[PDB]
Structures are given as C-alpha cells and as structure tokens.
Amino acid sequence: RNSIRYSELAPLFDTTRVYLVDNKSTDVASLNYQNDHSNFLTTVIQNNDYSPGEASTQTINLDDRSHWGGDLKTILHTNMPNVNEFMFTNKFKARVMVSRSLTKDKQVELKYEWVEFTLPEGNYSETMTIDLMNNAIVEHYLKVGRQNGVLESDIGVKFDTRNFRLGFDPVTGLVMPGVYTNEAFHPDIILLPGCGVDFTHSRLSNLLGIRKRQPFQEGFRITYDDLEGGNIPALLDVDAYQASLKKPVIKPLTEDSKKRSYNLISNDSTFTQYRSWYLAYNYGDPQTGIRSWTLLCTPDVTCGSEQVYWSLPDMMQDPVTFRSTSQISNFPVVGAELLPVHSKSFYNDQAVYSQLIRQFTSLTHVFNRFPENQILARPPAPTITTVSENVPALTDHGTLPLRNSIGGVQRVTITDARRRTCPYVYKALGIVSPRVLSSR
C-alpha cells in the first residue's frame, strides 16, 4: 500500500530518509573528481558493501501504487568574496583624461578615453573598496596620465563620501571654513569636465549605493554632463580674509600647498569645475537633475542579494513547467534560496581619527597621495563600516514530488541567477524524507 523497498532488505513503511551528501570517502575518490561542491554526484545507497557505481545499479523503490513526495531541507555554506570576478565586482569602466597637450600653436588639446580598471579580488569593507577604486584610477594615471601631459590637478573621476557643501554660505558663495568639512555622509562620485563613469557591467554600483530608478533599462552611465547643478563650491581664502582684518572674502582659494589648481570655472565664479553626484541629487533641480533618474540608497557591501537554485534531476519530478534535460545549465529547479551572505555592521568612531592614525599605522600614504588637495584627498572613513560575511544557511524547501524509483547515484546541482555552477560553495548537502501523497 505504501512500502519502500530496497534490494534485499526488510521493507520499510511510511517514510524514511535518503541522504544527499558530498563528503562520502568512496564516491569522492571515484565519481566526482573534475566536479565541485555545486555540481556533484553522490550515492544515496549508504550501504557499506557494494562498490559505488555498482551501487549505481541498485535503486530505492517507493511503492508504486502511490505518488510520493519528500521534504527537502538543505544545508548550504559558501565563502564568496565581497569583491570578485565571477560576481562582477572586480571591474568597472570609467572615463579619464589620457593626454594634455600644447597643440597647433595656441590650442589646448584634451584627449579623454574610456577604460576598465580591475580590483584585486577579496578586499572587503566598503570604505576600503572605495579606496581600492580611487587607487585604480591613479594606478592608471601612473601608466598613462603623467607621461602624456595631464597633471594631477586635472585627474578626472574620484569616488569620495562627503558633503562638499556643509560650510557653504549663501552670500559668500564659498565654504567659509576654508576646508570641505571632513565628515562622511554617503558615497558619491566626483567628475571633472569631459569625463565620467559607467557600471553597465558591474555590481559595484550597488556598493556605492547609487541605483537607477528604472533598473531594467540596461545601461548605467553617469557622465559629467549629467551631474548638472551641483559643482563643488570653492573654499574661502581663510588666510587672506583673517590677516586682512572691505574684507578679502571674495577670495576663493585657487590652489593649495604643492600648488595644484582647483580648476575654477572662471576668475570670477565661486564654483569649481568639480561636479559631485551627491550634490546633484539633493541640491540640484529635483525635476530635471539626477535625482530624477537615480536613487540614493543604503550601501550594502554584498553588492546585491542574489539567489541560487537547487536541482536534483534524478530524484524529484520536474516542477510544473520545466522540461527534463541533460544540460547542466537548464536542469529543473526544485528550490530557490538566497545566496548565504550578510552585511554585518560595525562601529569605528576610530574612522577619520583612524584615517589620521591609519596613515601612520600603514607605513604609506598610498591611498592619500594628495594630502593637501581638498578634493583629491582621501575620503573620510564613515562610522559604521559594513562587511560581507559568509554564513551557513539551514534552509527548508517544501515537500516535492519524487520518482518512485530513486537511482543509486543522484546528481546535485546548485546554480546561480544566470544559471551556472557557483565556485564559492564549500558545503552543500540535503536530507530528503519521502512520504505518501495519494494513490494511482
């Protein structure tokens, strides 16, 4: 009526457990080899005698007269890096200045080009991720920039995280303090005329916390031109003003120590040519600015909760509309589950008291190369850093229909959103508990 028979052993009734597990010493040796914990074979047999493979011949038979089903809970555990190549978090296109030249007697010829910089897999934490990006902009300048004109003064594109506009005085037209108040509010990206960044093929966008208000329109390009209204205002010549006590004030600090120009639009304007995203969003025209088509969001280092799909092709019936095949990247799905990664949050009031000390701690100002320029400076570390953290996930799918004849060797397969094994799985295993559902 509801048996469960196996080769030659006492028949069992009503229910039991078949175990899908990678570890088994025997099968690892033989079976999987060129496989990994995301696409492997395993014997469900569990009987000490019998050579695996020869096991493959045997079968667990759930009484034929009834349609069976089984509860499938699984234990999935990864250890995927915040920033890696497979997830698309190690690359990102941006347009920078390539050459600054003296041409055809009087012309200033500026040549800009798009280029894709890559990051060294792993390096978690958001802030640091920013830094690694800024550094990659530089590392490039080091291989092309300088040796083709282009000064530091005109480095296009830099990810910062502050509100260049806190000091700002509605009359002066300047950041009175003479310094862009060094506190971190949200990541944003700053651009110089003519350049900009593109994330079309990168989840890092999600790390900065900047998304399109219309996601499905593939094409994340944020040009200098887009950051309308909201160019970082200029600094008051704190020195002049004070010593001068008319009043100098109108004097908008044009350079800095080591004399770098703050590219001011004209000898008059209080504004600089440096455009900030964060500004355009909440300080620019809400109806036509950038706030119109992009959204200011919480960072999230994981870069985006993605899901993984399970499949047990040789043991569960194929769900409603999937068709059975043998193409690993199209197997039927039997369970979906978010990919095991969380955002742990911490507190480091030590940030920026630490950037200050961190710089001495790290024997180099590698990230802060321009410790004077109020722009190109090293963005403030925000209190509350986030870090992707891997965690085992004791998930639980529902009862799923089973085949009344379970093969000795079952194939287990965890796929990702785009349907492809996921290299970062360290442990995957599931427990199935069959039971009756109705009869034929």
């Binding site: 000091g167 005085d169 009175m176 303090p177 704190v238 004070q242 009043k247 004030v249």
Partner: peptide
Amino acid sequence: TFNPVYPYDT
C-alpha cells in the same frame, strides 16, 4: 559687519 558664524579662533 559680517558674521561668518564660525569660531575661526579654535
């Protein structure tokens, strides 16, 4: 007669 509204001294 302009208040910068900022304690520059300290």
